[PDB]
Amino acid sequence: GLAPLADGEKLYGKKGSEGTVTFTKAIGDNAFVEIKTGADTGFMNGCLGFSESIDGKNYWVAYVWQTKKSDTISIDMSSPVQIAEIIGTETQEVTDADTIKKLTDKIKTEKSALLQVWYASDKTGKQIDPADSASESIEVYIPSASADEALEHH
Amino acid sequence: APLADGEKLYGKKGSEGTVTFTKAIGDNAFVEIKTGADTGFMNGCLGFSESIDGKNYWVAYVWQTKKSDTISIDMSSPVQIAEIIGTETQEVTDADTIKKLTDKIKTEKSALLQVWYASDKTGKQIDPADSASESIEVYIPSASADEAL
Numbered sequence: 599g600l601a602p603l604a605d606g607e608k609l610y611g612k613k614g615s616e617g618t619v620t621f622t623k624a625i626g627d628n629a630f631v632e633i634k635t636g637a638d639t640g641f642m643n644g645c646l647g648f649s650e651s652i653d654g655k656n657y658w659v660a661y662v663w664q665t666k667k668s669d670t671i672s673i674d675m676s677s678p679v680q681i682a683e684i685i686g687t688e689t690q691e692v693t694d695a696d697t698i699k700k701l702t703d704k705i706k707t708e709k710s711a712l713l714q715v716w717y718a719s720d721k722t723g724k725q726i727d728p729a730d731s732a733s734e735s736i737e738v739y740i741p742s743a744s745a746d747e748a749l750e751h752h
Numbered sequence: 753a754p755l756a757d758g759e760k761l762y763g764k765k766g767s768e769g770t771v772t773f774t775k776a777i778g779d780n781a782f783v784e785i786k787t788g789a790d791t792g793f794m795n796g797c798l799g800f801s802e803s804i805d806g807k808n809y810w811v812a813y814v815w816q817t818k819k820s821d822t823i824s825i826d827m828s829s830p831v832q833i834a835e836i837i838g839t840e841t842q843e844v845t846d847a848d849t850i851k852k853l854t855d856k857i858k859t860e861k862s863a864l865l866q867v868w869y870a871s872d873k874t875g876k877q878i879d880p881a882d883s884a885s886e887s888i889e890v891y892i893p894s895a896s897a898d899e900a901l
Contacts, residue, residue: 613768616769616882618880647866647868649868650877651869656869658869660841664838679839679840680834684795684814687814687815688831689814691843708879710880714864716836723803725801727861728766729801
């Protein structure tokens with residue numbers, strides 16, 4: 599379920615104030631970031647972000663996406679790219695594959711995510727600030743229950 | 753150190769996790785948090801991006817609190833710096849690269865304001881994390897305050 603889906607198969611999340619997105623069920627294995635870029639936008643990147651606590655330790659996890667054009671980015675929730683333990687106001691990168699499994703396992707059960715646009719540049723390569731002014735719209739969806747059923751079976 | 757009401761230049765919050773100021777951020781930012789009644793802990797960051805010599809960077813200044821407070825952030829002292837290469841990241845240690853980044857950040861008029869994690873008094877996670885605060889605002893010193901060295 600990594601190919602973008604037909605209109606009736608998309609369960610869209612609801613965007614909060616601040617860059618949060620909330621769904622009416624667990625996110626599961628695949629999220630989709632649907633971006634319409636502004637006309638003079640050459641490049642954008644950002645992430646879907648999550649936090650979890652395990653055994654008294656706190657973690658921040660990011661799934662990085664990028665695009666050079668209006669597109670849907672298919673995000674694999676098994677495949678986070680940036681994982682840090684946050685110790686007070688310091689960070690420590692996490693490499694332990696067991697910890698990382700544990701984190702994604704939890705994440706796949708969460709109903710909300712942070713949606714963050716970190717960086718954007720125009721067609722000349724000049725930075726667009728704030729970065730989210732570089733998109734006309736950004737939305738996030740997950741597969742409908744019906745879509746998940748078909749995937750599977752298959 | 754905290755500062756008086758008439759000396760605070762507040763940033764304007766933008767719907768999507770951004771804060772924008774009417775002048776460059778400069779050396780010091782302040783994150784002013786009012787926590788909800790059942791909140792035990794919150795952390796997050798002020799976030800920036802820059803490009804240097806064809807490479808793209810994300811930079812975060814982490815803050816945390818257990819109570820309503822103002823967190824004073826030193827723009828010279830980012831805690832998380834990554835180069836973003838496609839959908840991979842690489843940690844950045846070079847103090848030189850870092851200095852270039854902070855120099856640029858100090859001239860920016862906007863920041864990302866992100867609340868990443870929060871837990872209640874029992875230690876149970878509050879989700880979304882920003883529901884754990886009644887208000888979060890960011891300010892920088894007024895021109896007059898800066899003039900005071």
